[PDB]
Amino acid sequence: ATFGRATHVVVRALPESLAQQALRRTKGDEVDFARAERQHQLYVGVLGSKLGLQVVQLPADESLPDCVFVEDVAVVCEETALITRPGAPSRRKEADMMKEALEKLQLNIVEMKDENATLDGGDVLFTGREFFVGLSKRTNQRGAEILADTFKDYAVSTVPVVDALHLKSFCSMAGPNLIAIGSSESAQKALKIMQQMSDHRYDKLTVPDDTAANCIYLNIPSKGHVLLHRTPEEYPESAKVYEKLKDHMLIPVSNSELEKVDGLLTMSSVLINKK
């Protein structure tokens, strides 16, 4: 496939219950819900209006406070979607509307039904050549095994996630051979493990703020190599690194409110390449 090509994107509206009731590891500043909604609107507007992806917007469900974070409930690779069994019990029913959306996009559907398996899509790094799957408090070995069985055309290897929510809490693909990676002790240890497991030499884009290593790369006809990344207002020292990339069309995207609930850029979309 052309790495990073997409035609469609699934997103989901924020429930009011997110502000107080979404899961979060840090009990920090309160969420400004209206501002979170605006940030989500702008994010969707980049993907759909600016970049031209066909947007499927799922409605909010107030009983699912984290339902905006569609990434965790599906992994899509080519024509196949894995509907995950998220680690958090409060998120499991998010799979219901996602399964229906992906069915309607004509994907082959595989459901993680094994009650001994969990997997969050945020733990999954697809490089274009292979998968790395974080083993975290959300994703277990059996989950990773089911992913490997689902996507047999690609190698799958695992990496411990120790002191973050997900693997992609501190990394993401920034381009076809380019892993964006944080500078923490933990981020760097994870990167070394991924690299030691692969026979492929990846380039890295190292940033000083781990959560600013979570970005979205797209290959869009008529625009080229596009990268959605955190803003200078939010992470000035990491934005300076992204700004050196004259080889990408850079789009700064604000995400401060959802980061209060550990939601990073990748978490709010599921990308699909159809036809």
Looking up tokens 């992806």 gives 53
- Measured at the CA of 148, the angle between CA 111 and CA 47, to 5 degrees, comes to 70
Tokens of 241: 């690194």
Gap between the Cα atoms of 234 and 198, Å rounded: 33
Within 13 Å, how many C-alpha atoms sit on residue 108's CB side?
6
Tokens of 49: 């209006």
User: Are the CB atoms for 86 and 94 separated by under 8 Å?
Assistant: yes
How many residues are listed for the chain in this entry? 275
Gap between the Cα atoms of 54 and 251, Å rounded: 18
User: Are the CB atoms for 230 and 18 separated by under 8 Å?
Assistant: no
Q: How many CB atoms lie within 10 A of CB 95?
A: 18
- Method of determination used here: X-ray
Gap between the Cα atoms of 44 and 254, Å rounded: 12
SS (H, E, C) the chain: CCCCECCEEEEECCCCCHHHHCCCCCCCCCCCHHHHHHHHHHHHHHHHHHCCCEEEEECCCCCCCCCCCHHHHEEEECCEEEECCCCCHHHHHHHHHHHHHHHHCCCEEEECCCCCCCCCHHHEEECCCEEEEEECCCCCHHHHHHHHHHCCCCEEEEEECCCCCCHHHCEEEEECCEEEEECCHHHHHHHHHHHHHCCCCCEEEEECCHHHHCCEEEEECCCEEEEEECCCCCCHHHHHHHHCCCCCEEEECCCHHHHCCCCCHHHHCEEECCC
Tokens of 108: 């082959």
Strands 108-111 and 249-252: unpaired
User: Are the CB atoms for 190 and 159 separated by under 8 Å?
Assistant: yes
Nearest to 97 by CA among 22, 12, 8, 6: 12
Looking up tokens 């120790």 gives 162
Residue 136 CB partners (closer than 8 Å, separation 6+): 87, 120, 123, 161, 164, 165, 166, 167
Q: How many angstroms is the resolution? A: 1.1
Gap between the Cα atoms of 89 and 93, Å rounded: 8
Gap between the Cα atoms of 88 and 110, Å rounded: 20
Domain 1-275 bears CATH identifier 3.75.10.10: yes
What would you report as the CA-atom Rg of the chain, rounded to the nearest whole angstrom? 17
